[PDB]
């Protein structure tokens, strides 16, 4: 369904891409988005889908817009417009300058020092899940590892019970890839309904878990409000339950289909962190954006105050103007250019946690289960939205080829 083209938008820039159901999805989601980078497509296009909005299709523009918070505000960062208007997570819904005091606080809960401290438990969980899978010779990777490994770590960090995962995972998914049963506003309202009593309890009686730290925290030296703490804890929940979970499935799908790549990593384990970075480029998965604060001419195009612009973080590293042969995975790639974790003042705060989870997964899996493949006949389906993912990933292996550590 197509919104009527606004008078200010030139007809020759129309390209009706649907970020929640892209045409070429059956080829793979990164592939489907990469159609925006085919020869005759301009650097900045307008789609009439999802209410109508701009899309920057090249890393140069994506980077520029993410740096210019004066013209490109994060106040309304999701498409469609009702989702972006409801969106109020902190720090993402704020621009500098007042954004920055809240980042600092979020860094006490997910920053490098905290990840270094979680390192042992992250390792232990990865090993326990993989060892229990190893003799079975099969798994449903999405449900049996990609979801439990990073989600159980987040719930440990937040001091939330694991049996709450199904509900919270359902809500987080309606915000990024809605099935249509809930609007963004309704899912948000439900996540905040979950958090409100836990935030009150933990202000009254502080523990050492992430929610306690945020809810009793200070920002530029003044106490955080209950409403602020809720808006920050909601975003940490979303990052914990719907980023790495999806990324692991893209990576393992790739490794299942590419023995020569696993072989490289089995033979040279020291290459694993570099391989992590190249898979973060090739299987980049996030796309949000910004709202115009004023009329503004950008790259020869007249943008109007209030227009939304999708700035897909996924696309910068896929752009052949940033990386030659961008669809090829090369663990030896000399200059891995990407914006997978965003760009500008909102650069991902969870990226150190995410890289630790990914590198630990690769090392631990490859040590125990070096040889695996996709279940025969399985037609692996991706799904697209603010964060893209893999619907199911059935894997099989011969337990005879595995290795107990």
Ligand X SMILES: CC1(C)[C@@H]2CC[C@@]1(C)C(=O)C2
Which residues are tagged catalytic? 177, 242-243, 348-350
Which of 250, 275, 238, 247 shows the shortest CA–CA distance to 349?
238
- Minimum Å gap between C-beta 168 and ligand X is 14
Nearer to K ion, 87 or 145 (CB): 87
**Residue 182: φ, ψ to 5°:** -140, 135
348 is in an annotated binding site: yes
By CB under 6 A, tell whether 386 contacts ligand X: yes
Asked if residues 56 and 308 have their Cβ atoms less than 8 Å apart, the reply is no
User: Could you give the residue ranges of the DSSP H alpha helices within 159-312?
Assistant: 165-176, 184-204, 210-215, 226-242, 244-257, 259-267, 272-282
Asked if residues 167 and 182 have their Cβ atoms less than 8 Å apart, the reply is no
By CB under 6 A, tell whether 387 contacts ligand X: yes
Helix (H, G, I), strand (E, B) or coil at 390: strand
Using CB under 6 A, pick the residue from 198, 286, 318, 395 that binds ligand X. Answer: 286
By CB under 5 A, tell whether 72 contacts K ion: no
Asked if residues 86 and 190 have their Cβ atoms less than 8 Å apart, the reply is no
By CB under 6 A, tell whether 110 contacts ligand HEM: yes
CA distance 322 to 310: 19
By CB under 6 A, tell whether 361 contacts ligand X: no
- Minimum Å gap between C-beta 176 and ligand X is 5
Ramachandran class of 198: left when φ > 0, alpha when ψ lies in -120 to 50, beta otherwise: alpha
What residues from 159 to 188 belong to the interface with ligand X (CB under 6 A)?
176
Size of the site for ligand HEM (CB under 6 A): 27
Nearer to ligand X, 90 or 219 (CB): 90
Q: Token digits for 120?
A: 């042992």
- Binding segment for K ion among 59-67, 79-87, 282-290, 381-389 (CB under 5 A)? 79-87
For residue 110, the partner it binds in ligand HEM, ligand X, K ion, none, with Cβ less than 5 to 8 A by kind, is ligand HEM
Using CB under 6 A, pick the residue from 47, 50, 92, 249 that binds ligand X. Answer: 92
- Minimum Å gap between C-beta 401 and ligand HEM is 29
Q: Is 208 exposed, middle or buried (0-12, 13-18, 19+ CB in 10 A)?
A: exposed
Please provide the DSSP assignment of 74-87 as one string: TTS-SSSHHHHHH-
- Residue ranges that bind ligand X, judged by CB under 6 A: 89, 92, 176, 235, 238-239, 243, 286, 288, 386-387
- Residue ranges that bind ligand HEM, judged by CB under 6 A: 74, 77, 91-92, 103, 106, 110, 154, 235-236, 239-240, 243-244, 247, 286, 288, 313, 340-342, 346, 348-350, 353-354
């Amino acid at each position: 369904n197509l919104a009527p083209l606004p008078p200010h938008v030139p007809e020759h820039l129309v390209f009706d891409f649907d970020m929640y159901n892209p045409s070429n999805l059956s080829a793979g989601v990164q592939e489907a988005w990469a159609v925006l980078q085919e020869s005759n497509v301009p650097d900045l296009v307008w789609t009439r889908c999802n209410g109508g909005h701009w899309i920057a299709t090249r890393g140069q523009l994506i980077r520029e817009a993410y740096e210019d918070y004066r013209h490109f505000s994060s106040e309304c960062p999701f498409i469609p417009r009702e989702a972006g208007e409801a969106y109020d997570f902190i720090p993402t819904s704020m621009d500098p300058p007042e954004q920055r005091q809240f980042r600092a606080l979020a860094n006490q809960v997910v920053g490098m020092p905290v990840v270094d401290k979680l390192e042992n438990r992250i390792q232990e969980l990865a090993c326990s899940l993989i060892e229990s899978l190893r003799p079975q010779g099969q798994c449903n990777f999405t449900e049996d590892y990609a979801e439990p490994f990073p989600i159980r770590i987040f719930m440990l960090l937040a001091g939330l019970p694991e049996e709450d995962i199904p509900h919270l995972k359902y809500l987080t998914d309606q915000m990024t890839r809605p099935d249509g049963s809930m609007t963004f506003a309704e899912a948000k309202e439900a996540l905040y309904d979950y958090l409100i009593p836990i935030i009150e309890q933990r202000r009254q009686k502080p523990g050492t878990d992430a929610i306690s730290i945020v809810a009793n925290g200070q920002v530029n030296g003044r106490p955080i409000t209950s409403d602020e703490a809720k808006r920050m804890c909601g975003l940490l929940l979303v990052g914990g339950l719907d980023t790495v979970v999806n990324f692991l499935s893209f990576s393992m799908e790739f490794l299942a289909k590419s023995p020569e790549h696993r072989q490289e990593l089995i033979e040279r384990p020291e290459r694993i962190p570099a391989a992590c970075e190249e898979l973060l480029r090739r299987f980049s998965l996030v796309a949000d954006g910004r709202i115009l604060t004023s009329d503004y001419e950008f790259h020869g195009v007249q943008l109007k105050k209030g227009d939304q612009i999708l700035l897909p973080q996924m696309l910068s590293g896929l752009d052949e103007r940033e990386n030659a042969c961008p669809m090829h995975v090369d663990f030896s790639r000399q200059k891995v250019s990407h914006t997978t974790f965003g760009h500008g003042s909102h650069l991902c705060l969870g990226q150190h946690l995410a890289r630790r989870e990914i590198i630990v997964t690769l090392k631990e899996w490859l040590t125990r289960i070096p040889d695996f493949s996709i279940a025969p006949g399985a037609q692996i389906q991706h799904k697209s939205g603010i964060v893209s993912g893999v619907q199911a990933l059935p894997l099989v292996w011969d337990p005879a080829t595995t290795k107990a550590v």
